[PDB]
Amino acid sequence: AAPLLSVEGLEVTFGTDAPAVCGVDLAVRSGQTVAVVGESGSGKSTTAAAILGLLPAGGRITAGRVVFDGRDITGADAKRLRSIRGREIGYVPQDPMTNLNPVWKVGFQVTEALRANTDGRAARRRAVELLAEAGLPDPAKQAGRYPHQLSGGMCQRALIAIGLAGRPRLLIADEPTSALDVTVQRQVLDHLQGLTDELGTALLLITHDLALAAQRAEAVVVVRRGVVVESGAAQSILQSPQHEYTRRLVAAAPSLGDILVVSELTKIYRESRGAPWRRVESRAVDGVSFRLPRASTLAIVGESGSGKSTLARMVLGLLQPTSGTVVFDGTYDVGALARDQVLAFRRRVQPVFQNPYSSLDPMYSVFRAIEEPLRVHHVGDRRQRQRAVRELVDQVALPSSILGRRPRELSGGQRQRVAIARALALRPEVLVCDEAVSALDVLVQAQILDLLADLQADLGLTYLFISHDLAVIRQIADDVLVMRAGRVVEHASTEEVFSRPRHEYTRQLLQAIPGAP
Amino acid sequence: CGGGVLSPDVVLVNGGEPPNPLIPTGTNDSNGGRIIDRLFAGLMSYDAVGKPSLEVAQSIESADNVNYRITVKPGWKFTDGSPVTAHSFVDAWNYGALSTNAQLQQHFFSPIEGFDDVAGAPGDKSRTTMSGLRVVNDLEFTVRLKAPTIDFTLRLGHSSFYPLPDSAFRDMAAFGRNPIGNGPYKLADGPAGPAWEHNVRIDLVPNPDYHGNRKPRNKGLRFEFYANLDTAYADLLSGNLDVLDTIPPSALTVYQRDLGDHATSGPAAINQTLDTPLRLPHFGGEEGRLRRLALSAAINRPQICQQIFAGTRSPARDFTARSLPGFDPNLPGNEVLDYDPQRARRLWAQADAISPWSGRYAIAYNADAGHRDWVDAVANSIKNVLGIDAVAAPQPTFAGFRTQITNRAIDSAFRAGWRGDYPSMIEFLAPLFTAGAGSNDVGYINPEFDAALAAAEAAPTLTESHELVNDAQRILFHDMPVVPLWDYISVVGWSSQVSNVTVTWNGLPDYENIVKA
Amino acid sequence: MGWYVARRVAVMVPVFLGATLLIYGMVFLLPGDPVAALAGDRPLTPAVAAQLRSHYHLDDPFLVQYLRYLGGILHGDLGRAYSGLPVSAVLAHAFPVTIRLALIALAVEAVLGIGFGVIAGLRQGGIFDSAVLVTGLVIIAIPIFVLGFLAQFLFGVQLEIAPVTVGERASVGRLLLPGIVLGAMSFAYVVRLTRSAVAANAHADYVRTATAKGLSRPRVVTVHILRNSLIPVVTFLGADLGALMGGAIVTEGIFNIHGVGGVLYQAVTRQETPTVVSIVTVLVLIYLITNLLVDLLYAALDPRIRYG
Amino acid sequence: HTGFWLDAWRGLRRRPKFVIAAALILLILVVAAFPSLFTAADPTYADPSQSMLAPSAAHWFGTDLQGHDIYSRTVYGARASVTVGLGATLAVFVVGGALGALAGFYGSWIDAVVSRVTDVFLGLPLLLAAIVLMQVMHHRTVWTVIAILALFGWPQVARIARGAVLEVRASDYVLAAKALGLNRFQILLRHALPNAVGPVIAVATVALGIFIVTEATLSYLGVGLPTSVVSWGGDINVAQTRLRSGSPILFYPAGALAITVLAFMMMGDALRDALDPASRAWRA
Domain residue ranges in chain A = 1-90+170-253, 99-167, 258-348+429-510, 365-427
Backbone angles phi, psi at B5, to 5 degrees: -125, 40
Mapping DSSP to helix (H, G, I), strand (E, B) and coil, where does residue B280 land? Answer: coil
Q: Which residues contact B250 (CB under 8 A, 6 or more apart)?
A: B230, D241, D242, D245
In chain C, what residues touch B8 (CB-CB under 8 Å)? Answer: 83-85
Nearest-CA neighbor of C293 among C237, C229, C227?
Answer: C237
A358-375 core/surface letters (b: 16 or more CB in 10 A; e: else): ebbbebbbbbebbbbbbe
Cα A360 from Cα A416, distance rounded (Å) = 9
Q: Would you say the C-alpha torsion A110, A115, A117, A120 has a positive or negative sign?
A: positive
B501: left (phi over 0), alpha (psi -120 to 50) or beta: beta
Cα C304 from Cα C302, distance rounded (Å) = 6
Which residue type, as a one-letter code, is found at position D271? L
- Beta-strand ranges (E) seen in B121-200 are 140-144, 185-187
Q: Which residues contact A423 (CB under 8 A, 6 or more apart)?
A: A350, A351, A352, A431
Cα A412 from Cα A440, distance rounded (Å) = 7
Resolution of the experimentally solved model in angstroms: 3.3
Q: How many CB atoms neighbour CB A28 within 10 A?
A: 22
Q: How far is C224 from chain D (nearest CA, A)?
A: 16
- Beta-strand ranges (E) seen in A170-257 are 204-206, 219-223, 228-233
Nearest-CA neighbor of C28 among A111, D136, D257?
Answer: D136
Cα A444 from Cα A451, distance rounded (Å) = 10
Alpha helices in B79-192 (DSSP H): 86-96, 115-120, 152-155
Q: Which residues contact D231 (CB under 8 A, 6 or more apart)?
A: D76, D77, D80, D81, D219, D224, D225
Alpha helices in B229-313 (DSSP H): 230-237, 285-297, 301-307
**CB-CB contact of A12 with A49 (8 Å):** no
**CB-CB contact of B473 with B318 (8 Å):** yes
Q: Which residues contact D144 (CB under 8 A, 6 or more apart)?
A: D137
In the Cβ-directed half-sphere of A357, how many Cα atoms lie within 13 Å?
5
Which residue type, as a one-letter code, is found at position C293? L
A-D interface: how many C-beta pairs under 8 angstroms?
A: 54
Mapping DSSP to helix (H, G, I), strand (E, B) and coil, where does residue D52 land? Answer: coil
Q: How many CB atoms neighbour CB A346 within 10 A?
A: 22
Cα B266 from Cα B489, distance rounded (Å) = 6
Q: Would you say the C-alpha torsion A328, A331, A337, A342 has a positive or negative sign?
A: negative
The strand pair at A479-484 and A487-493 is best described as antiparallel
In the Cβ-directed half-sphere of C29, how many Cα atoms lie within 13 Å?
11
Q: Would you say the C-alpha torsion B94, B99, B105, B107 has a positive or negative sign?
A: positive
The answer to whether the annotation marks A148 as part of a ligand binding site is no
Cα B94 from Cα A360, distance rounded (Å) = 108
Q: Which residue of B has its CA nearest to D245?
A: B254
In this structure, is residue B482 part of a structural domain? yes
Element (H, E) at A244: helix A244-250
Q: Which of D7, D167, D173, D184 to mutate to test the interface with A (most CBs of A within 10 A)?
A: D173
A435: left (phi over 0), alpha (psi -120 to 50) or beta: left
In this structure, is residue B175 part of a structural domain? no
Q: Which residue of D has its CA nearest to A315?
A: D179
Backbone angles phi, psi at B462, to 5 degrees: -95, -35
Calculate ∠ Cα A401-A406-A412, nearest 5°: 85
Could you give the angle at which helices D142-169 and D111-121 cross, rounded to 10 degrees? 140
In the Cβ-directed half-sphere of B350, how many Cα atoms lie within 13 Å?
13
The answer to whether the annotation marks A307 as part of a ligand binding site is yes
Same domain, B389 and B410: yes
* Class of domain C91-272 (CATH, top level): mainly alpha
**CB-CB contact of A501 with A507 (8 Å):** yes
**CB-CB contact of C269 with C253 (8 Å):** yes
> Can you spell out the DSSP letters for chain C?
-HHHHHHHTTTTHHHHHHHHHHHHHHTTSSSS-GGGGGGTTSPP-TTTTTTTHHHHTTTS-HHHHHHHHHHHHHTT-----TTSS-HHHHHHHHHHHHHHHHHHHHHHHHHHHHHHHHHHHSSTTSHHHHHHHHHHHHHHHS-HHHHHHHHHIIIIIIS-SS-S---S---HHHHHHHHHHHHHHHHHHHHHHHHHHHHHHTTSHHHHHHHTTT--HHHHIIIIIHTTTTHHHHHHHHHHHHHHTTTHHHHHHTTT--SHHHHHHHHHHTT--HHHHHHHHHHHHHHHHHHHHHHHHHHHH-TTT---
Cα D259 from Cα C141, distance rounded (Å) = 8
**What burial class does residue D67 get, using C-beta atoms within 10 Å of its C-beta: 0-12 exposed, 13-18 middle, 19+ buried?**
middle
Alpha helices in A262-383 (DSSP H): 309-315, 339-345, 372-376
Q: Which residues contact A326 (CB under 8 A, 6 or more apart)?
A: A260, A262, A265, A314, A315, A333, A334, A335
Looking at chain D from residue 124 to 163, which residues have their Cβ under 8 Å from any Cβ of chain B? none
**What burial class does residue B393 get, using C-beta atoms within 10 Å of its C-beta: 0-12 exposed, 13-18 middle, 19+ buried?**
middle
Find residue B142's DSSP bridge partners.
Answer: B69
Same domain, B385 and B470: yes
Same domain, B408 and B511: no
**CB-CB contact of B405 with B277 (8 Å):** yes
In this structure, is residue B439 part of a structural domain? yes
Long-range Cβ pairs for the range B470-476 (8 Å, 24+): B470/B328, B470/B331, B472/B429, B473/B318, B473/B319, B473/B320, B473/B331, B473/B425, B473/B429, B474/B331, B474/B332, B474/B333, B475/B448, B475/B449, B476/B319, B476/B429, B476/B433, B476/B449
A115/C214 CB distance under 8 A? yes
Element (H, E) at B21: none
Q: Which sequence spans correspond to the domains of chain D?
A: 8-280
Calculate ∠ Cα D164-D167-D173, nearest 5°: 115
Looking at chain D from residue 190 to 219, which residues have their Cβ under 8 Å from any Cβ of chain A? 191, 194-195
Find residue A174's DSSP bridge partners.
Answer: A206
**What burial class does residue D34 get, using C-beta atoms within 10 Å of its C-beta: 0-12 exposed, 13-18 middle, 19+ buried?**
exposed
Nearest-CA neighbor of A173 among A182, A160, A158, A183?
Answer: A160
**CB-CB contact of B274 with B416 (8 Å):** yes
Cα A515 from Cα B260, distance rounded (Å) = 95
B191-206 core/surface letters (b: 16 or more CB in 10 A; e: else): eebbbbbeebbbbbbb
Could you give the angle at which helices C172-201 and C127-141 cross, rounded to 10 degrees? 120
**The CATH classification of domain A258-348+429-510, taken from the options 3.90.400.10, 3.40.50.300, 2.20.25.190, 3.40.50.720:** 3.40.50.300
Same domain, B240 and B314: no
Cα B373 from Cα D171, distance rounded (Å) = 77
The answer to whether the annotation marks A151 as part of a ligand binding site is yes
Long-range Cβ pairs for the range B113-117 (8 Å, 24+): B113/B144, B113/B145, B113/B146
**CB-CB contact of A460 with A295 (8 Å):** yes
A508: left (phi over 0), alpha (psi -120 to 50) or beta: alpha
Over its C-alpha atoms, chain D yields an Rg (Å, rounded) of 23
Could you give the angle at which helices C87-121 and C231-244 cross, rounded to 10 degrees? 140
Cα B253 from Cα B175, distance rounded (Å) = 44
Find residue A302's DSSP bridge partners.
Answer: none
Q: Which residues contact C8 (CB under 8 A, 6 or more apart)?
A: C292, C295, C296, C299
> Can you spell out the DSSP letters for B318-383?
SSS-SSSSS--TT-TTTTSSSB-HHHHHHHHHHHTTS-S--S-EEEB-B-SSS-HHHHHHHHHHHT
CA distances from A374 to A385, A388, B53 (A): 7, 9, 113
In this structure, is residue B411 part of a structural domain? yes
**CB-CB contact of A222 with A247 (8 Å):** no
A117-140 core/surface letters (b: 16 or more CB in 10 A; e: else): eeeeeebeebbbebbeebbbeebe
The answer to whether the annotation marks A43 as part of a ligand binding site is yes
In chain D, what residues touch B230 (CB-CB under 8 Å)? Answer: 241
**What burial class does residue A399 get, using C-beta atoms within 10 Å of its C-beta: 0-12 exposed, 13-18 middle, 19+ buried?**
exposed
Q: How many CB atoms neighbour CB D2 within 10 A?
A: 12
Cα A166 from Cα B277, distance rounded (Å) = 113
Q: Is some CB atom of chain B closer than 8 A to the CB atom of D241? A: yes
What is the CATH architecture of A1-90+170-253?
3-Layer(aba) Sandwich (3.40)
Cα D91 from Cα D96, distance rounded (Å) = 8
C43/B199 CB distance under 8 A? yes
> Can you spell out the DSSP letters for D164-219?
HHHHHHTSSHHHHTGGG---TTHHIIIIISGGGHHHHHHHHHHHHHHHHHHHHHHH
- Considering CB atoms only, which of D48, D49, D245 is closest to B253? D245
Backbone angles phi, psi at B265, to 5 degrees: -155, 160
Element (H, E) at B202: strand B201-206
**CB-CB contact of B447 with B435 (8 Å):** yes
Distance of CA A482 to the CA centre of its chain: 19
Write the secondary structure of C193-215 as one string of H (helix), E (strand) and C (coil).
HHHHHHHHHCCCHHHHHHHCCCC
Cα C205 from Cα C228, distance rounded (Å) = 13
D221/C250 CB distance under 8 A? yes
Q: How many CB atoms neighbour CB D32 within 10 A?
A: 20
Instruction: Count helices and strands (H / E) in chain D.
Output: 11, 0
The structural domain count of chain B equals 3
Find residue B44's DSSP bridge partners.
Answer: B54
Mapping DSSP to helix (H, G, I), strand (E, B) and coil, where does residue B66 land? Answer: coil
Write the secondary structure of A295-314 as one string of H (helix), E (strand) and C (coil).
CCEEEEECCCCCCCHHHHHH
Q: How many CB atoms neighbour CB A481 within 10 A?
A: 23
Describe chain B by its helix, strand, coil percentages, rounded to 5. 25, 20, 60
Cα A105 from Cα A143, distance rounded (Å) = 7
Q: How many CB atoms neighbour CB B230 within 10 A?
A: 14
Cα A6 from Cα A72, distance rounded (Å) = 10
Backbone angles phi, psi at B485, to 5 degrees: -95, -60
Same domain, B356 and B430: yes
Torsion of CA A127, A130, A132, A138, to 10 degrees: -30
Element (H, E) at B284: none
Q: Which of C8, C11, C24, C146 to mutate to test the interface with D (most CBs of D within 10 A)?
A: C146
Cα C277 from Cα D128, distance rounded (Å) = 10
Q: Which sequence spans correspond to the domains of chain C?
A: 2-74, 91-272
Q: Which of D18, D25, D121, D136 to mutate to test the interface with C (most CBs of C within 10 A)?
A: D136
Q: Is some CB atom of chain D closer than 8 A to the CB atom of C251? A: no
**CB-CB contact of A351 with A434 (8 Å):** yes
Cα B488 from Cα B269, distance rounded (Å) = 7
Mapping DSSP to helix (H, G, I), strand (E, B) and coil, where does residue A255 land? Answer: coil
Q: Which DSSP symbol is given to A109?
A: H
Task: Show the domain range for B426.
Answer: 268-489
Cα A516 from Cα C256, distance rounded (Å) = 87
**CB-CB contact of D216 with D234 (8 Å):** no
Could you give the angle at which helices A185-192 and A152-163 cross, rounded to 10 degrees? 20
In this structure, is residue B418 part of a structural domain? yes
Same domain, B386 and B358: yes
Q: Is some CB atom of chain A closer than 8 A to the CB atom of C234? A: no
**CB-CB contact of A437 with A448 (8 Å):** yes
The answer to whether the annotation marks A507 as part of a ligand binding site is no
Q: How many CB atoms neighbour CB A102 within 10 A?
A: 17
Q: How many CB atoms neighbour CB C292 within 10 A?
A: 18
CA distances from A331 to A292, A313, B448 (A): 16, 19, 136
Over its C-alpha atoms, chain B yields an Rg (Å, rounded) of 24
What is the CATH architecture of D8-280?
Orthogonal Bundle (1.10)
Element (H, E) at D5: none
Q: How many CB atoms neighbour CB A398 within 10 A?
A: 19
**CB-CB contact of A286 with A486 (8 Å):** yes
Distance of CA B157 to the CA centre of its chain: 14
Cα C250 from Cα C255, distance rounded (Å) = 8
Looking at chain C from residue 72 to 101, which residues have their Cβ under 8 Å from any Cβ of chain D? none
Length of chain C equals 308
Cα B84 from Cα B394, distance rounded (Å) = 50
Element (H, E) at D257: helix D251-275
In the Cβ-directed half-sphere of C107, how many Cα atoms lie within 13 Å?
12
